[PDB]
């Protein structure tokens, strides 16, 4: 039994409630045990409890007297028990209950009014039971109930007589998922005082029954509606008729295997704001199919269209101007589909569109011309996602229409060509370009000329050609702060490659072949590419095969806070290499071949470090090699992960596998 002001006795196989708990506890957690009974006498001294959780037990029934023992009880969780029958005495004396959980108790039917004196109850959960009806009382009570959960039951009908007990109640959420309901008795929804959210997920309805349902929701106070997976195969302009008389703002129609969307199907919801149509089987989207939805601000069409039939060549066709009505649409997610291509007037109309996700939305978008994104001309687009579209070529002036574009993701494609610079023409407000994971990009001096306002450039694993150009291809990028050039295995770069990037803060260069460039044997000496980076904050140089480090490479890196030189063949470092790193807070040198740590190297480095990482190193356990290091470790404030565990010595054989933490420095 763990006491932390909240008594937690979970998974202890307790057959009886503990009697040694302090009189200070207010919460009791008894999930997963073997309690069959709950006597009141065992709960007398603990009259300060405000929350009780006894889920996953074998409790048969509940004593009325017990409810008198906890006058401060707010939340009661009785989920997954054997509590099958309820009476009026069960929860009678628990008037302060605000949350009651009764899931998976195999309750088949509720007697009279067990919850009549629970007028403080806010959330009632009766999920995963065997209730065939919704009647929970014969009078009006529970005016404070806001959530009624009735998931996974045998409820077949909603009757006014059974649901009018909440006439003076305001239900925010009426959960009726996984229920086979086949009829809605007239006036059942008006029987409730205030119904805001209706959830009919996993409920076999059909266009007709859903139509009658919508007719039943008319003139109500509904705001949220979820008809997900109701197998709504088709929709006409009569299906959502009743909803004409509602102020609905959220509609979920996902997982319905929706084949055809008839004209003016959603013309009855001019107040809808959130539309979920993800995961369907739409074969043909007509023009006026999305008419009337001029207040929608978010539309999700993920996997909403049919897959390619391969043989039948059955491609999901989207007619022109099909999105023109959603004038207030700001967020459009059409990712993961088999749309043939981008028509000339496909996205015409969306004059508030700020986010467009086209991730894998097309069968093959192999070429980006100047006419491709012409429909988005009058859209204030800020973010465009074009990943996983098999794009193999980007022509000039392809993004002229997206003048306000800020974030462009062209990653995860087959882009293999020469960047002339004209590909970025029009992007005056460009912020970041994600070009990672592609074929090949041949670089030129004019490659990024037209976009000097760029701050973040990602070229991870794309095979950069001519990156070793004398006038650096990155020269016009003055405002660049983050540059990713990892996984490219570039064997040659020049001195002035990072010239002009005085505002650069984060530099990723891991998994390249820059080793030869830093050896003393390299023609013309070492390549000091870290020259003039006065604002570099995070430097990544892992997995380069570095066996040598020149003394003055890290000279102009004063503001460098995090340095990553792990996963290299580094061993002996020259003196005063980190002499200019005063603002260093994180040092990474794990998985190297370091065999000596001396003061003349890690002196100014260990000054204000808060994170040291040299996990896998073959240290040498002698005085002149480890004394200063161990003596520093014993008195440092630096947080060192796996300090006593993985800091082992590989030499001398006397200290093989011996932790450096336990080395004796009294002999030195």
């Amino acid at each position, epitope marked *: 039994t763990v006491s932390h002001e909240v008594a937690d006795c979970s998974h202890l196989k307790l057959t009886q409630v503990p009697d040694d708990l302090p009189t200070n506890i207010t919460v009791l957690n008894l999930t997963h045990n073997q309690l069959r009974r709950l006597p009141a006498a065992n709960f007398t001294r603990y009259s300060q409890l405000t929350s009780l959780d006894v889920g996953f037990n074998t409790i048969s029934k509940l004593e009325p007297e017990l409810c008198q023992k906890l006058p401060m009880l707010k939340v009661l969780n009785l989920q997954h028990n054997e509590l099958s029958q309820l009476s009026d005495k069960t929860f009678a004396f628990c008037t302060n209950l605000t949350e009651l959980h009764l899931m998976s108790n195999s309750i088949q039917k509720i007697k009279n009014n067990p919850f009549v004196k629970q007028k403080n109850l806010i959330t009632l959960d009766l999920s995963h039971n065997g209730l065939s009806s919704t009647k929970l009382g014969t009078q009006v009570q529970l005016e404070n109930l806001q959530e009624l959960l009735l998931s996974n039951n045998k409820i077949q009908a909603l009757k006014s007589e059974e649901l009018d007990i909440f006439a003076n109640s305001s239900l925010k959420k009426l959960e009726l998922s996984s229920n086979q309901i086949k009829e809605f008795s007239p006036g059942c929804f008006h029987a409730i005082g205030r119904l805001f959210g209706l959830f009919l997920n996993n409920v076999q309805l059909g266009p007709s029954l859903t139509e009658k349902l919508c007719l039943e929701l008319a003139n109500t106070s509904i705001r949220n509606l979820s008809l997900s997976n109701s197998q709504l195969s088709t929709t006409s302009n009569t299906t959502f008729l009743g909803l004409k008389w509602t102020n609905l703002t959220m509609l979920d129609l996902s997982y319905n295997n929706l084949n055809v969307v008839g004209n003016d199907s959603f013309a009855w919801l001019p107040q809808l704001e959130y539309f979920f149509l993800e995961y369907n089987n739409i074969q043909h989207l007509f023009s006026h199919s999305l008419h009337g939805l001029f207040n929608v601000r978010y539309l999700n069409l993920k996997r909403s269209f049919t897959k390619q039939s391969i043989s039948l060549a059955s491609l999901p066709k989207i007619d022109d101007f099909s999105f023109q009505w959603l004038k207030c649409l700001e967020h459009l997610n059409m990712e993961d589909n088999d749309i043939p291509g981008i028509k000339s007037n496909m996205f015409t109309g969306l004059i508030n569109l700020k986010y467009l996700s086209l991730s894998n939305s097309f069968t093959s978008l192999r070429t980006l011309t100047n006419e491709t994104f012409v429909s988005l001309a009058h859209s204030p687009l800020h973010i465009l996602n074009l990943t996983k579209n098999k794009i193999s070529k980007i022509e*000039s002036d392809a993004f002229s229409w997206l003048g306000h574009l800020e974030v462009l993701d062209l990653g995860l494609n087959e882009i293999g060509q020469e960047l002339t610079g004209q590909e970025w023409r029009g992007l005056e407000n460009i912020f970041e370009i994600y070009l990672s994971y592609n074929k090949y990009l041949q670089l030129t001096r004019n490659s990024f000329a037209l976009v000097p306002s760029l701050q973040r450039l990602m070229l991870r694993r794309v095979a950069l050609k001519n990156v070793d150009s*004398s006038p650096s291809p990155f020269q016009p990028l003055r405002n660049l702060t983050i540059l990713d050039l990892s996984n490219n295995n570039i064997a040659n770069i020049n*001195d002035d490659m990072l010239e002009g990037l005085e505002k650069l803060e984060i530099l990723d260069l891991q998994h390249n072949n820059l080793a030869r460039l830093w050896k003393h044997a390299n023609p013309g000496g070492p390549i000091y590419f870290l020259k003039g980076l006065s604002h570099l904050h995070i430097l990544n140089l892992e997995s380069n095969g570095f066996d040598e480090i020149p003394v003055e490479v890290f000279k102009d890196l004063f503001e460098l806070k995090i340095i990553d030189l792990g996963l290299n063949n580094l061993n002996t470092l020259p003196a005063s290499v980190f002499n200019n790193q005063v603002s260093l807070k994180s040092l990474n040198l794990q998985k190297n071949l370091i065999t000596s740590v001396e003061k003349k190297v890690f002196g100014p480095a260990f000054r204000n470090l808060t994170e040291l990482d040299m996990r896998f190193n073959p240290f040498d356990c002698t005085c002149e090699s480890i004394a200063w290091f161990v003596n520093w470790i014993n008195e440092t404030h630096t947080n060192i992960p796996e300090l006593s565990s993985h800091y082992l010595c590989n030499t001398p054989p006397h200290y093989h596998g011996f932790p450096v933490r336990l080395f004796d420095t009294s002999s030195c």
Partner: antibody
Amino acid sequence: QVQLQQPGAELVQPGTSVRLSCKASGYIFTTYWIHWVKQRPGQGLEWIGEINPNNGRINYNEKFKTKATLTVDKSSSTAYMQLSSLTSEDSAVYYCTRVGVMITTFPYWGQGTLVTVSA
Amino acid sequence: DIQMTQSPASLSASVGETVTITCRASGNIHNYLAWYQQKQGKSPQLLVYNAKTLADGVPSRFSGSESGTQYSLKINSLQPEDFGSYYCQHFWSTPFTFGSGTKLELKR
């Protein structure tokens, strides 16, 4: 705001060599490369070459490969272009240009130096 | 080495008229075209860059057009102070080549 200053005119002897001065002020000299241009009276203009004030790297034109020799004094913030073996066909105006935020432009020009080979 | 063939030889047009200078690129230089105006003596002043974009401070009458290897500088309604020599240039591949140049005189 930003000036590149070259001498007024330079009179020279045929066969000899002459260095041309280009002092950069108003900004950080070690920012943009210095380009050079040869313009004969009435004739067209020729792009001589571009030089990096940082490492001294030079991209030359194949015509001025043996006629023009570019250097840069970073401490003095000055680009120097030395013309060797002067003939009368080398008598022209020589400009030092720079690039702007758009590197495909030549915004900043010097007032040019008039080289006269006559003896 | 991409060359620049400028047309015409010389040009004379009165005030208020529209003039058009032409530049023929020997090879593909994309849109990287610069148009300079130069009055005799002073260093060349940049008028147009990237073929379509005007320099900061340059009057609206100057406007560039682009098509293939044909790059044209168009002045609508000349003014008496628009005289001098006009040159063109590419910024694609080194070495940079200029145009032959068109001298513009006016009439009244």
